[PDB]
Coordinates of C-alpha atoms in Angstrom, one line a residue:
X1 CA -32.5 178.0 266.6
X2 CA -33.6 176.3 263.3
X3 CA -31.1 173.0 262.2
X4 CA -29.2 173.1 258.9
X5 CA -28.9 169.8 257.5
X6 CA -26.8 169.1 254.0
X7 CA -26.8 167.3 250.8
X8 CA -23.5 166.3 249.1
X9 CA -25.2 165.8 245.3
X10 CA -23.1 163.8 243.1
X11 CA -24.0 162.9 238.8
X12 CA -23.4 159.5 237.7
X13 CA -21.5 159.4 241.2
X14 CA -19.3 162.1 240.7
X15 CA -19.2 164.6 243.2
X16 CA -20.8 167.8 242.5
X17 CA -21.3 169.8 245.2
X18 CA -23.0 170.5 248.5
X19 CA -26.7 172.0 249.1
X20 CA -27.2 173.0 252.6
X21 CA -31.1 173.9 254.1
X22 CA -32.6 176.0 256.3
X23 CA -35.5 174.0 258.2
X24 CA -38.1 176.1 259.8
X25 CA -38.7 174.2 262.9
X26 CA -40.1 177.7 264.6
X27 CA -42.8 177.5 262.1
X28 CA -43.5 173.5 261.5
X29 CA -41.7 171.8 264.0
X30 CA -43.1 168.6 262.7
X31 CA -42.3 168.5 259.3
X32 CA -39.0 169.8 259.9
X33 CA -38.0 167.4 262.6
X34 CA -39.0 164.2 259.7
X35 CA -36.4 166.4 257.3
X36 CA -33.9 166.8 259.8
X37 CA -34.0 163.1 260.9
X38 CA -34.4 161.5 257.5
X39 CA -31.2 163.7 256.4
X40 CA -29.3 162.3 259.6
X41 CA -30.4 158.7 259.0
X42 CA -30.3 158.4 263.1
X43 CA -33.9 156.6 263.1
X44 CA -32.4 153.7 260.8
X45 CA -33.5 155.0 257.0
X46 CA -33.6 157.9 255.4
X47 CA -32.2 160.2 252.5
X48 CA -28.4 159.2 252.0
X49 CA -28.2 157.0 248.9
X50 CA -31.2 158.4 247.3
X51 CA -32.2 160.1 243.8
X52 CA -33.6 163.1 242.6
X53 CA -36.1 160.8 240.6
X54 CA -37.6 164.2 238.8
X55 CA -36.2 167.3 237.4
X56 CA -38.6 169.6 235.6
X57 CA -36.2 172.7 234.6
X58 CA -37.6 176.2 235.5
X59 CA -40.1 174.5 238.2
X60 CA -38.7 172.1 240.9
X61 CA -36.4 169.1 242.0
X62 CA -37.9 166.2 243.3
X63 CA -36.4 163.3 245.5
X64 CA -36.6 161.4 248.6
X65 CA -38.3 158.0 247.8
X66 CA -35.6 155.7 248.7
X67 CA -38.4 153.1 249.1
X68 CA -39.7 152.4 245.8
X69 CA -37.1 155.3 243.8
X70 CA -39.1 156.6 241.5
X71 CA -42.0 158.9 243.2
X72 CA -44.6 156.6 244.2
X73 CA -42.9 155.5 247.7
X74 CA -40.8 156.9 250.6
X75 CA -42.1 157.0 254.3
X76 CA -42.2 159.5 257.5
X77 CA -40.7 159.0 260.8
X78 CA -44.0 158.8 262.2
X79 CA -45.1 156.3 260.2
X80 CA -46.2 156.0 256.3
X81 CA -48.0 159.2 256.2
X82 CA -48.6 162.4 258.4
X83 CA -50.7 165.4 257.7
X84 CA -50.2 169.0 256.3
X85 CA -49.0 170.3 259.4
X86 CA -50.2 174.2 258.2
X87 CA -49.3 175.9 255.5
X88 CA -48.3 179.2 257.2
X89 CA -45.3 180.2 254.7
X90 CA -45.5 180.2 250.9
X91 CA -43.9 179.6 247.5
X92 CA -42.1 182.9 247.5
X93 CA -39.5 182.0 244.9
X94 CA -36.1 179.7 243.7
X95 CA -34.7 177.7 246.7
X96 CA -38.1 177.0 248.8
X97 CA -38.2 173.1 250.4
X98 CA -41.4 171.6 250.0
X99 CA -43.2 168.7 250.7
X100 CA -44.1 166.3 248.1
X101 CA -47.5 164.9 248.5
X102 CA -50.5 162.5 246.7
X103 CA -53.3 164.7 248.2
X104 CA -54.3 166.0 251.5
X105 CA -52.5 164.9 254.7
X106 CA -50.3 162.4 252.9
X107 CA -47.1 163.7 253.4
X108 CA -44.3 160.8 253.8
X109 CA -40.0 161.5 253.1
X110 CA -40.6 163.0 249.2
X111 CA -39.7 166.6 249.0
X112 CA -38.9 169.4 246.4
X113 CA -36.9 172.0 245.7
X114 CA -38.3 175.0 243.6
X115 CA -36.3 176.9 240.8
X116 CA -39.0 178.8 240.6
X117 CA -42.0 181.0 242.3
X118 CA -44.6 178.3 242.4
X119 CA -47.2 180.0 243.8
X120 CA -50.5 178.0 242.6
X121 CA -49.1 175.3 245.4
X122 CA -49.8 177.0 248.4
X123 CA -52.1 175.7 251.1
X124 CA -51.7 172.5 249.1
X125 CA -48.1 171.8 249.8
X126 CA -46.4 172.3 253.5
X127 CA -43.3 174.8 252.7
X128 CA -40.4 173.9 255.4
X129 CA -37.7 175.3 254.6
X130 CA -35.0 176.4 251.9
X131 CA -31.8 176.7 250.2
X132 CA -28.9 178.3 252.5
X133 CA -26.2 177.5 250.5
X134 CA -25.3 176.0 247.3
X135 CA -28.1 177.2 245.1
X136 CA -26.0 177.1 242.4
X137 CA -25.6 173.4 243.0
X138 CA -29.4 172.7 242.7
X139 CA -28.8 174.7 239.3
X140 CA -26.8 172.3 238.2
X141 CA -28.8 169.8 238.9
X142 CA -31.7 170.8 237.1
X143 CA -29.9 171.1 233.8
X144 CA -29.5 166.8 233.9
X145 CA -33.7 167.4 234.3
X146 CA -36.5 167.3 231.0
X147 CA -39.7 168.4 230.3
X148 CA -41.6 165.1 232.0
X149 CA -38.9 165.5 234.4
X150 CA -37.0 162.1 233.9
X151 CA -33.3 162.4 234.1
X152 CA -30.5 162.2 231.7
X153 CA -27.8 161.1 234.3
X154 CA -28.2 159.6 237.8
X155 CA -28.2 162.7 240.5
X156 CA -27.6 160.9 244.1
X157 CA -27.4 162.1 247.8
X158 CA -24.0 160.4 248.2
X159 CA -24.1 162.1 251.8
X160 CA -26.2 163.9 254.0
X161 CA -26.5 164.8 258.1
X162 CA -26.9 167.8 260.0
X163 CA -24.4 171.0 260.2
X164 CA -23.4 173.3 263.5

């Protein structure tokens, strides 16, 4: 009974192609309900018009700070910051969603995908959910990425919402 929401990526806003997520809401109900509502925008804000603001190749994609678009903003639907609700399920490999945070119990709307086993962040990042389909899109992406993880074209959320 978990949701599935979707990304429709796009580069330099052309379309590239859609990511869709598994959120484990039997595991952290919490953090996957602020997922699932930022990506349907039915709380008035949220992820549809935002940037992956940080592509490191061969470790993660970063986005959802469509406050301040650029990693040091974005906001929860409980308010500017909510804690690590548990970190009962790991960094097991390519596709995991993550939360993005600036130290303990400060987790907002930024997120990551991993491209790779990141295991040195568990218990210090809340894993909710991950990659259903389109992995290969979130490949792509990472190639427009660098080594400090700034971004050589623009990669959007031109759409987003829940599936099923």
């Amino acid at each position: 009974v978990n949701p599935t929401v979707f990304f429709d990526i796009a580069v330099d806003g052309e379309p590239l192609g859609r990511v869709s997520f598994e959120l484990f809401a039997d595991k952290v109900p919490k953090t996957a309900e602020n997922f699932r509502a930022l990506s349907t925008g039915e709380k008035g804000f949220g992820y549809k018009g935002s940037a992956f603001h940080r592509i490191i190749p061969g470790f993660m994609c970063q986005g959802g700070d469509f406050t301040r678009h650029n990693g040091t903003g974005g906001k929860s639907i409980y308010g500017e910051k909510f804690e690590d609700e548990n970190f009962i399920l790991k960094h097991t490999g390519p596709g995991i969603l993550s939360m993005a945070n600036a130290g303990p119990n400060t987790n907002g709307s930024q997120f990551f995908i991993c491209t790779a086993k990141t295991e040195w962040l568990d218990g210090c990042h809340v894993v909710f959910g991950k990659v259903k389909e389109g992995m290969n899109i979130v490949e792509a992406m990472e190639r427009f990425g660098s080594r400090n993880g700034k971004t050589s074209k623009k990669i959007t959320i031109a759409d987003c919402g829940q599936l099923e």
